[PDB]
Curated annotation (Swiss-Prot), chain A:
It comes from the Viruses. N-glycosylated. It comes from Eastern equine encephalitis virus (strain Florida 91-469) (EEEV). It is found in: Virion membrane; Host cell membrane. The chain holds residues 900 to 948 of 1242 of the full protein. It is a single-pass type I membrane protein. The precursor of protein E3/E2 and E1 form a heterodimer shortly after synthesis. Processing of the precursor of protein E3/E2 into E2 and E3 results in a heterodimer of the spike glycoproteins E2 and E1. Spike at virion surface are constituted of three E2-E1 heterodimers. After target cell attachment and endocytosis, E1 change conformation to form homotrimers. Interacts with 6K protein. The lineage of its organism: Viruses, Riboviria, Orthornavirae, Kitrinoviricota, Alsuviricetes. Class II viral fusion protein. Fusion activity is inactive as long as E1 is bound to E2 in mature virion. After virus attachment to target cell and endocytosis, acidification of the endosome would induce dissociation of E1/E2 heterodimer and concomitant trimerization of the E1 subunits. This E1 trimer is fusion active, and promotes release of viral nucleocapsid in cytoplasm after endosome and viral membrane fusion. Efficient fusion requires the presence of cholesterol and sphingolipid in the target membrane. This is Spike glycoprotein E1. Glycans are attached at N36.
UniProtKB/Swiss-Prot annotation, chain B:
It is a single-pass type I membrane protein. Processing of the precursor of protein E3/E2 into E2 and E3 results in a heterodimer of the spike glycoproteins E2 and E1. Spike at virion surface are constituted of three E2-E1 heterodimers. Interacts with 6K protein. Plays a role in viral attachment to target host cell, by binding to the cell receptor. Synthesized as a p62 precursor which is processed by furin at the cell membrane just before virion budding, giving rise to E2-E1 heterodimer. The p62-E1 heterodimer is stable, whereas E2-E1 is unstable and dissociate at low pH. p62 is processed at the last step, presumably to avoid E1 fusion activation before its final export to cell surface. It comes from the Viruses. It is found in: Virion membrane; Host cell membrane. It comes from Eastern equine encephalitis virus (strain Florida 91-469) (EEEV). Palmitoylated via thioester bonds. These palmitoylations may induce disruption of the C-terminus transmembrane. This would result in the reorientation of E2 C-terminus from lumenal to cytoplasmic side. N-glycosylated. This is Spike glycoprotein E2.
Length: 49, 53
């Protein structure tokens, strides 16, 4: 004539802040590049476009 | 203190012990206490860290 309770419960692990699978949804976005420009008698100048 | 019990045999009476000066981690292999047991926290020493192997 006795009773043992013994409940259980699932929670996030402590290593979930260092490796996890992020789940993203992708739409169309911007396109960038980088160019190297020289013309005539000047040196190469580069910029992000 | 004391309380000499007026019964005969030692096999027909259970005994317990209430120590509350210190506190223990709530294991799954220990019996739960009486009422509201508080949520007081201890830090975990060796946490994961991202290093170079």
């Amino acid at each position: 004539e006795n009773t043992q309770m013994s409940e259980a419960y699932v929670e996030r692990s402590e290593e979930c802040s260092i490796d996890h699978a992020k789940a993203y949804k992708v739409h169309t976005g911007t396109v960038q590049a980088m160019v190297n420009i020289t013309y005539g008698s000047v040196s190469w100048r580069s910029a992000d476009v | 203190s004391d309380h000499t019990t007026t019964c005969t045999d030692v096999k027909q009476c259970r005994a317990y012990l209430i120590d509350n000066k210190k506190w223990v981690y709530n294991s799954g292999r220990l019996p739960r206490g009486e009422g509201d047991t508080f949520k007081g926290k201890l830090h975990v020493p060796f946490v994961p860290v991202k290093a170079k192997c």
